[model samples]
Target chain A: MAIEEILDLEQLEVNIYRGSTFGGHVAGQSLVSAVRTVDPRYQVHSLHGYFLRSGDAQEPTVFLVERTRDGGSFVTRRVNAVQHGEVIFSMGASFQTAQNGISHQDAMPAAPPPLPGLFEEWDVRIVPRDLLAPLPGKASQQQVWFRHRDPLPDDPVLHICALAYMSDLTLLGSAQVTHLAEREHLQVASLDHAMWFMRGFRADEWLLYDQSSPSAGGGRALTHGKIFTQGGELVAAVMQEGLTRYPSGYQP
Target chain B: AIEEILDLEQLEVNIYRGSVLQRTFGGHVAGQSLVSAVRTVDPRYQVHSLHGYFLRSGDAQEPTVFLVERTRDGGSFVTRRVNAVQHGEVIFSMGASFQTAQNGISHQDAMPAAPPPDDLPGRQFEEWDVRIVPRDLLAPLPGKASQQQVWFRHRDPLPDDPVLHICALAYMSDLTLLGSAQVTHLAEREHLQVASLDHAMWFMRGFRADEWLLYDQSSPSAGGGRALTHGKIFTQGGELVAAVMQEGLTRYPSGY
Candidate 1:
């Protein structure tokens, strides 16, 4: 891989990739690489990342790892991604050994069942290509249940990264979805994202992802989500807002 | 004792008077107004760190004045704090800082899709008769519980100073965000229990509060009988400008 890699601890790792055409936002991918480097026993349960700058799609990004805290039940780490000698993205994450909790949550909102059946790997591409725009794009919302074809171990950190991965896909789409439909590219971008892990669960196991937009104004959009296991346990609560704006052309 | 701290040909900013609506005898007056007075000057500054202690409560009839101390100016940000006093007695104090928009890089988690604020309905507040009275008032709205949500808006149109707007938001941030915990489910006729021991807000980006912003709040889980609540602010155009989550002391009929 073009990404530079280093191990910070037995179960914590850091990766820095050259900014490429793939995505200017390196923090999300760095997070994925970090989780993949760790032992299967350690899984990402929850993480909060703030972007300081967009990575140079042409330069190398640096990943700095510091083990913030570790305890019997949880471990926390801080990762800073730097480029051009300046910090561009930083994140704080917690990984936990799965444990039992008295499970309870507001019931997941009612919705139609998933698409009729699974499509072949190639056929899945036919699913609406427009659904992935950065939030405030063209479509204001979307949802799906994603799993690694290569089964994931029950490690909680992987679950957290998987959740983070899924999170990066949704908020921006609402902005993008709106854009594809003919709206102008209002200055839409994420300002911050925070996730709270409520219970333990495997990422390979199907977890229903639901998303929606409640409000947006003063150049921003507010969105929130609930991740649920097949058994109906609410595994997490997600909240985010993207910097949203309407270019002079769009009215309303 | 009052001077316009910030005056522009376009807009004017000044610190005026505020009173205690609820009488908590021993609470420090200085600690209370520290935040209140700072908010009166400008609101866009994110309150990264603050420390204060209650001194004494001020009489509702008295006028409080805020004196601002401009502490530092850096390439990217500014810092200021205010000292609030009433009837010649020091009542409250606070410090805050502001940041200018810079082009570096940006990334954030996607906004969660929970039920819309409208779908949640006004039933939560209607059943409780909870209301937010003007700051100038003395009597707390006689209600069953401390948790309440009444739609609120700034009385005056704001000027171009994003900082002042943010400070005004800070003023409103101290509103009844903590009040939603007990009122969400209490049967209208029942005497439910709740109270806000403290409150705060962290502005994620530049935003205006004069426009209608929905303060969606909830107390998802409470344990050991204490209720923890979270709130999000959505501007009319749908920008989520702020998020606030707090844990408070709660009481129920089965116990204290």
Candidate 2:
């Protein structure tokens, strides 16, 4: 499927939309819903969301967008993804009309050539295994490279939504992928995802996702990420907390 | 201010009321809203994280109402949403999640070295103490090297509720983060109009607020009239107690 199809939104009514619930990419799809209501001149800069429940693939999810704020330059919207009459995901997205300003960014760290794939939507690559120096059962850091599989158009919001999707797929598991690599058979689910987009980059080109897990306890772990272009421009930042155990309501 | 700021009058099962003491400070409003969220949550659940959006500037001319929404009372995590309203408009909206205590495997970045609060010069705001890691350390950050370190705590002691300390930390967390973004070009951009656009905090653990705590602040990117900053708050003993991420409207007027 095309990247556009992966993030397609079907408008049901004013301020509302619907999409398939084979639900792995709500962060990106919900973003598309928010972008639908915003003026194309305004660019999305940040988003925060909580995965309230696991979506049922058999059912479609309806998105209701609340007009939170519309200022001279900034616009805000809240999105609630409803499935079977329950909110399966809730999110807040903010946008701004482009402006000039001072600039500063984190220096991109170094890594070797990548060997990667995310299959259909993303062309993902990871640092070659031989060069990846993961500590024995204790590596909390991960750096991967990816870009949209399609040569997406020049609409900035589309690329923003694209990165938004790819980020959720990989963050919050940095620790489990290394820190607890030996463990198996653990149920994992994303609890919340947050990101700030400071600069724009073409998602159709290679971009590095460097993430680290700072803490993991009580069946949850927190991870932070920075996305940089191949030329070393830091474009976005991300953070997410995930349930390391089954997300059944209340646990002992 | 801890006593007065959180001295909110419970108006209804899901509503709270309090007056602002000179408003629009990101930390104060965010802190008060967190306290507002806790009021509706069960005592068994402690706030683990909160994400907020600054919808409008707050003015203290009128009292504010904190309308709390019980988003969920999930099995392991209780979620609450709060909106600080005045003049029939929402100024700040926040969503916080509380988790019943639990302990499993844990890992954290080690705290960096810094002098104790006793050695740094003390400054006061709302009776809370703030001691910044000297300007010499903070000033040299190149425009690209935006970073700052500081120490702060409640000036007076209060009840031993861990929740209050977390709220107080939310209050103080706003103090230095925005300033770090201007550290590189301090002289020329000192008077720019800046306001926090969003605030996100993950409470790893709440430390005693009356004691000193350290913050390592840095800005990863700033452009398009906005800047992004993050903080790692550690206890004096070096435990990473909280993490903060924020974006600010560092608006430089049409021209200097």
Candidate 3:
């Protein structure tokens, strides 16, 4: 169930690739398509994607890559996830060649798990301090320990892409803690997500994902995430805004 | 101070023009594109958030043109996409969304307290009065300082237009955010070349550009010649005005 073939994309034409799944694969596969078109030397550094419309799991998604810019040190790619000839999602990703530079990272938090997994691919273990779905009056925070259950090869690209597939999992859950009691008719959806990959690590290896909802309003909530290796090294930082609401009357 | 910096001319409908710069400082380009999109939107709606990517650097000799595309328009919300073009190529692209007036609950972490700007000494960068809170407050180590806080505002009074104030905040948000990531590894900044890659913001409430606001910045992570930073803007009275984030190309001269 892991995302080797799970994230596999079939190309229909030069700039178009096909895939299936939720926003995770639509976004993960979209990054895969963009990575293929760029020069192989550039490492995947950062990406920002907007979830425009819902995905139909019954059908496949067509991801189109736009070569936005290629500069001396950086390469930019824009991808649109399309279904039924309409765009469902879009992303802008930047890649860079290796270079020596100044480096420093905030220290990882001290207190920081496994359980029944909603994400069948990766082994997701919540940090058991809070309920799986926290209630109001509790803190808006969730810490998770996750990794690919099935180990694979050492290709850095595959490792990062696999991790990207799992990055979407459990991030926005922390935001729902506030409105958990308000209305049973909750409308949950991912609005947008952005990630900065600071360092690379294997997907099969255990990693710590620290998440919190710093702000929420207007039927919307924002979550910030920090991903660290089991060795206590900070690897990536992620942020997302998702629909944490209970409304159907308004449609945009 | 604000007018001369973000000055833009309407070339025609759906298009606006601004200056070309080598020392552009980048936030100005982003703020210009944002203002361009704001002009095209119905004034009834106000910008709630925006996300932008820097595609390429612009040519200093030529003027940059901002082209706005109406992505979506609804009763309560509207979205616009902007492309910054120079030398016939895209230098930057952004998506901004505006919303009709509405009220909702806010889950906010309490803003940290610091000395008022009135008591702190001031400096100048682009005519904006800037007061950087004590570097020692964040505990300045040899190379890396923990975090940075500064007080800033347009020295000259700006017009009463609310959109101008928002654009000015957007313009100033792009400044100083990326540097937070490099505070840990400060080389001769002359050798440490840096440029913003992406800028995103969530405007929480309204604040005037002419009034002093505090910006608290910190970097979460940095590696592979890139760094990610986050900023929280608060009014002098400690109201959270906006939250900003960025990833910048942070690197020094390297062997090819």
* TM-score of each model, in listed order: 0.52, 0.92, 0.90
lDDT of 2 by residue, B1-256 (tens): 5656677888888988887522235566777788889988888888888899988877766778899988888878888888999889889988998888654446777676677778788523766778888856443322346778888887788788777777777777766677778877577586566778898989886588888888888887788888899888888998888889998988777776
lDDT of 1 by residue, A1-252 (tens): 112221112232344333221222465555654554444455454455545455677766666665544445444555667777866655655554443321113555444434532212111111143443233321245555644444555645445645565565555554443445434445656544656556667765666666655444444555666677767666776666555665545554
Candidate 2 - CAPRI tier? acceptable
Tell me the tens digit of each residue's lDDT in model 2 across A177-222: 5545425535567889898988779888889888788777766788
TM-score of 1: 0.52
TM-score of the second chain in candidate 3: 0.89
Give candidate 3's error at residue B39 in angstroms: 2.8
Docking class of 3: acceptable
Q: Comparing 2 and 3 by TM-score, which wins?
A: 2
Best by DockQ, which number? 2
Interface RMSD of each: 12.1, 4.2, 5.0
Q: Of 1 and 3, which scores higher on TM-score?
A: 3
Encode model 3's per-residue lDDT on B14-80: one tens digit a residue: 9999875322546667888888998899999888778889877666578889999887677766778
Q: Give all candidates' CA lDDT scores.
A: 0.47, 0.79, 0.76
Worst 10 residues of 3 chain A by lDDT: A130-139
For model 1, report DockQ. 0.04
- Lowest lDDT sum, 10 consecutive residues, model 1 chain B, at B1-10
- Binned by DockQ into CAPRI classes (incorrect, acceptable, medium, high), candidate 1 is incorrect
Query: Which runs of model 3 end up more than 4 angstroms from their true locations?
Result: A113-118, A130-139, A183-185, A246-252, B4-7, B19-25, B74-76, B102-105, B123-126, B139-145
Any runs in candidate 2 off by more than 4 Å, and if so which? Answer: A21-24, A116-118, A128-139, A246-252, B20-24, B122-126, B135-144
